[PDB]
Design a protein around this ligand. Structure first.
Ligand SMILES: O=P(O)(O)O[C@H]1[C@H](OP(=O)(O)O)[C@H](OP(=O)(O)O)[C@@H](OP(=O)(O)O)[C@@H](OP(=O)(O)O)[C@H]1OP(=O)(O)O
Ligand SMILES: O=P(O)(O)O[C@H]1[C@H](OP(=O)(O)O)[C@H](OP(=O)(O)O)[C@@H](OP(=O)(O)O)[C@@H](OP(=O)(O)O)[C@H]1OP(=O)(O)O
Ligand SMILES: O=P(O)(O)O[C@H]1[C@H](OP(=O)(O)O)[C@H](OP(=O)(O)O)[C@@H](OP(=O)(O)O)[C@@H](OP(=O)(O)O)[C@H]1OP(=O)(O)O
Lengths: 121, 121, 121
């Protein structure tokens, strides 16, 4: 799943985002196929990774087994978290820098989703 | 797992259920055998399929992973939804007519259950 | 995982516990490594087996898939339920005595955890 989830542009910053913040050589194509083929190992439609919404619901489905899940499953969840921010063309140097973006997004949605329920009236 | 889930009679209608409405192929023995070696893979006791209730909750167990599930997870959930209707001896032409059965059945119970609740009172 | 999950002390009572209450075969070391290799297969972090809290959550993570789970999952859940009491140095004869009192543990907290709710104020 190389030419299906990362276009010519999104595939540049991906290989530029190093695995861990205080770490060297960045993400690679083996991770997208690893995450994709790992998604069938856990029975989750890999096609959702192609969109900016499938990667968002996959994270939700993965959060249940977050604090007790395995370590490689954490890498799977982390890789998708980056791909999510990747599809949005966000500024991200390493992995941890992206999850805080997602961690920042949760409140933003609630800060604005709840800003809509009260916006009426 | 062939002489246990579907009896000689219940298997009669099973062999006729078309896999797809706009298709011709109908169910077979492998579709329940494959289903057998699919829930054990996903840590689910297959014996539940034998009963008319062991299939009404396996689907409830798979509904969470349905909207984001893989392809075989969909076909797996398909085979059980039909087996439930079979254990009810309900006349279902193809897969779709059975898929709507459960959804047409959810409100059915809830309609009279809630009514039965309000009926007491 | 043989020299990490259970210390020299708690590694003895495990050897004393027989598989079934009215049975003979007792627990061994292949049940912890097997349980370790299994939760690994289930995207579960094995390290939590080494603490009195790492297994309290694994049980909760497995409680949902209990009523419809497989038998080797039935055995896997039973293994951690026993080693949990092992990490508590509780006196349990067989696998059932621990299971019976594991469900004897939630309400006791709620018994006085809800007490503190009214004890405060
Ligand atoms: O490792 P280097 O070849 O010395 O250059 C790296 C990095 O290289 P890669 O990300 O491709 O591995 C960037 O990419 P290149 O220009 O070398 O292709 C480069 O410049 P860009 O980031 O603009 O692409 C620069 O990063 P930056 O310019 O943001 O500082 C950074 O140089 P350092 O080795 O000094 O970190
Ligand atoms: O006596 P009914 O008005 O016919 O209701 C009874 C029953 O009543 P009691 O158990 O209190 O005698 C339950 O009462 P409510 O829930 O409506 O208050 C009700 O629902 P539940 O049992 O789910 O609580 C349902 O029982 P069941 O759902 O098991 O069939 C059953 O109503 P029906 O006699 O119409 O079936
Ligand atoms: O099997 P036995 O050698 O006959 O002894 C067993 C048991 O041994 P197991 O670990 O093999 O089950 C205990 O330990 P050991 O005799 O092997 O040292 C022993 O004493 P402890 O339980 O205090 O260790 C006692 O168990 P209990 O007194 O709780 O019944 C019980 O003896 P019997 O099976 O012969 O009654």
């Amino acid at each position: 799943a190389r030419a299906s989830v990362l276009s010519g542009g999104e595939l540049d910053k991906w290989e530029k985002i190093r695995l861990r913040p205080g770490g060297k050589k960045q993400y690679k194509l083996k991770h997208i196929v690893w995450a994709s083929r790992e998604l069938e190992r856990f029975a989750v439609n890999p096609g959702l990774l192609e969109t900016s919404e499938g990667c968002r619901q996959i994270l939700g489905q993965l959060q249940p087994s977050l604090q007790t899940g395995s370590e490689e499953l954490r890498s799977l969840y982390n890789t998708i978290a980056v791909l999510y921010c990747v599809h949005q063309r966000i500024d991200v140097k390493d992995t941890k820098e992206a999850l805080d973006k997602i961690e920042e997004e949760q409140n933003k949605s609630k800060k604005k989703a709840q800003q809509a329920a009260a916006d009426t009236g």
